[PDB]
Amino acid sequence: VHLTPEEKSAVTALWGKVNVDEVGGEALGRLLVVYPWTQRFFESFGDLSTPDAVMGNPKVKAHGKKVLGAFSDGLAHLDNLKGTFATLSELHCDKLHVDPENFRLLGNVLVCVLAHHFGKEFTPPVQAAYQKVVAGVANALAHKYH
């Protein structure tokens, strides 16, 4: 997408303070709690039956870290989110069959999680720049579906 660079360095400063190991697991955790029909791709992960299980479940924390490490790769290729994500886009389509509307739902839980985590420091204009990145990644990752 293009961010004005007042947007670009908004996103980039904030993200240098993130814990990708812990916002990882909370974002993918709260997706599986707040939108429970998304647990259909993760039953192999165990006990996902209360909120406190989902959040305690270490495969959930582990793969969140892996979701959020790839996320950080495109925050570094913001110019080119499509070539950077063409491969996982193909992979979520063709080997994982993930409905790309879930990419929008993780998008918006990640913005709730960054508000949570940065408090007042996640101002209306940093959110607005971060709604433009998570639509960009959701888009980039829907990219190779057919």
């Binding site: 429970p36 029909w37 389509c93 069959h97 409905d99 879930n102 057919h146």
Partner: protein, 141 residues
């Protein structure tokens, strides 16, 4: 709210679909998979090519389920209670896809009911497809 004009307009257009519902179900499915191809990540296990007996057999179940909801228009949350439990707990199809099937069902009826698909039957049909989606999505959480 389905008004009493709506129920008459939906029982009038669906009655005229008739022994052809099964057929019209499959053609909706097909139109959905070609126009909104993310809707295909829900059928990975299907033969989704044209005239597939799997698409024509899923067409017949979607279509029977609509016949039963038109027949108990008056009491949908109860006629459709096993399929809202199935949808909500095994299928867990994202709610947006209900919009994309109702649009490809509305274009299949228009295509085949020239004389019956009037502005007001269309509003009635679009209202009823939106209550059936709301009821199959009711117990998602």
């Amino acid at each position: 709210v389905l008004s009493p004009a709506d129920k008459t307009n939906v029982k009038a257009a669906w009655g005229k679909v008739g022994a052809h519902a099964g057929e019209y179900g499959a053609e909706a499915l097909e139109r959905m998979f070609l126009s909104f191809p993310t809707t295909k990540t829900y059928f990975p296990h299907f033969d989704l090519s044209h005239g597939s007996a799997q698409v024509k057999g899923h067409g017949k179940k979607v279509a029977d389920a609509l016949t039963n909801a038109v027949a108990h228009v008056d009491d949908m949350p109860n006629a459709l209670s096993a399929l809202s439990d199935l949808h909500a707990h095994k299928l867990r199809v994202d709610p947006v896809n209900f919009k994309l099937l109702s649009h490809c069902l509305l274009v299949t009826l228009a295509a085949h009911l020239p004389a019956e698909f009037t502005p007001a039957v269309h509003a009635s049909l679009d209202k009823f497809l939106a209550s059936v989606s709301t009821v199959l999505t009711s117990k998602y959480r």
